[PDB]
């Protein structure tokens, strides 16, 4: 431990949150709204037959 000493690799808390530039694209992308709840979200037809 005489060389690398940048906080003992405590990174990924800031300057490294690049996930934001992927979230931005996910929002401004033309992906569908696929789901499994039959688009109702409140089926509850005798204890969620699904």
């Amino acid at each position: 431990n005489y060389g690398r000493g940048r906080e003992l690799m405590y990174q990924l808390e800031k300057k490294g949150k690049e996930i934001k530039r992927d979230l931005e694209k996910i929002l401004l992308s033309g992906q569908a709204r696929t789901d499994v709840l039959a688009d109702q979200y409140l089926t509850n037809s005798a204890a969620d037959p699904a």
Binding site: N1, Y2, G3, R4, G5
Partner: protein, 49 residues
Amino acid sequence: NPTLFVSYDQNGKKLSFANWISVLSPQDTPFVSMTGKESINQTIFSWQT
């Protein structure tokens, strides 16, 4: 039906175990106990000569 109660009918013992253990395995490490130690940063290192 005893009449003397001599060190055998005494129920409810405690076993008077000891408070140590004898690890007789050989732990003698003279080379290690003699050679010093040094904190290294990375896995790989070097020394000049």
